[PDB]
Amino acid sequence: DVQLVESGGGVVQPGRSLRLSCAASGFTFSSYAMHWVRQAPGKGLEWVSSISGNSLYKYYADSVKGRFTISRDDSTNTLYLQMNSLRAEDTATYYCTRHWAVGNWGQGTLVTVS
């Protein structure tokens, strides 16, 4: 059974650094490109960074280019994201997944039980 676990989040002075990790289990890790995605409160899902399955090619969204750097340790089946120079716009819940495509989600609707 395929599971992914995120860790490393916490509150940080605007300009410091903080590194996240993703513990992958249940799928041949090397055979997946791997993605970081973030959901800023009130907003949608935003692509942050990605690394190819063979650790050779990393990619970054513009909002994050130059400040963040993605890594992948195939031995321990964990994916990392080093965030440097944290801005306030970086604040979100950060998820790791093994697949992203840009425009696949609606805006939402609110259902309220009273």
Place this chain on the structure above:
Amino acid sequence: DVQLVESGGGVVQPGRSLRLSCAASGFTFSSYAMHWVRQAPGKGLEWVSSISGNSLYKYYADSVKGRFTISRDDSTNTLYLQMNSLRAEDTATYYCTRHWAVGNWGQGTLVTVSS
């Protein structure tokens, strides 16, 4: 352009019914499975339902089994999620997506910049 737009919820007595809908545009609707994903304000997002591209296979999370039923009208690019026996934990923001991975993530970790 793609674009797919939801509608529906607001005002709900615990035990009544509610039907949501998604207007699809810009892609061959038929050839993508469709999913409802649930965002309870303050906790993460959880997949709730999915229907195959050919309307042949439905899937529901246990929290919702028996209470929700999905449909898909291939003639007119729209997706539906019928919500009978609405409980209280059901209150949340409902997204409709075609994403090939849905729920390919942990609970996420929260990063907060500035105090």
Place this chain on the structure above:
Amino acid sequence: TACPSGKKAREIDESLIFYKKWELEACVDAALLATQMDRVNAIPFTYEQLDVLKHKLDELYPQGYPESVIQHLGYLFLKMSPEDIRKWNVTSLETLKALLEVNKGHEMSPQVATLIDRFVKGRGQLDKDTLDTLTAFYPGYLCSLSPEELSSVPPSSIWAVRPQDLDTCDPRQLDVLYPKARLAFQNMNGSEYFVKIQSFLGGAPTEDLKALSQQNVSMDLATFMKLRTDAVLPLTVAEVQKLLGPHVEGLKAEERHRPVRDWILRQRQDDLDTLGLGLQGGIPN
């Protein structure tokens, strides 16, 4: 709407996601896409954009993709059609693994179906390692076959079947499987033979059950209830005892059901007495 570039494109990278569909058709040499296939799944292209990448791969490789390109398909495998996959010659188990892993939990589509058919046809057999890889992803695979196919899988392959895989096999499938297990296992001795053959006994004959009884094998009640019926029927009360070893007491508990009711009824009621157990039924005086 157009047909040229302005800037072209020479790397397959995060810039591309901002192109319009035609710009991609204009600016991406298919031969480049093929040569950098190992990084497409890192670039969050939209699914319509993937369509135009897929198309380009078709242009370049019109009689079927090479395994050079298949390997790195990742999620693109979701856009293939069975005619696409029918042109392929996939020969590494690892490539197969890679492709199965993408629709891991799903009801086998015509795509993975034809993929698996292509893979096996092209080794000549289900060898064993192939069968390992397949039950890893589709457990009911062996019993998803059909006694026609099963007659072809070589006994060598049987070592890859684990007993819980036979759960969905019906007796016409075991009819062709059991003789295959018999071959796969003659090199075994006794208590070791039984632990392997056990799951396959649902298709064994009395001649073979009888021979087992004469060994020490301590057959469990669960497997006995899966025995034939036609095979248990001619077994002497003495033979069934030596067979079930210390599990005999199950008989009264399964007095009513399956092949035991049938086996009781054909026995002299003065023989069931020898069992302790206190079995009711069967023929008097």
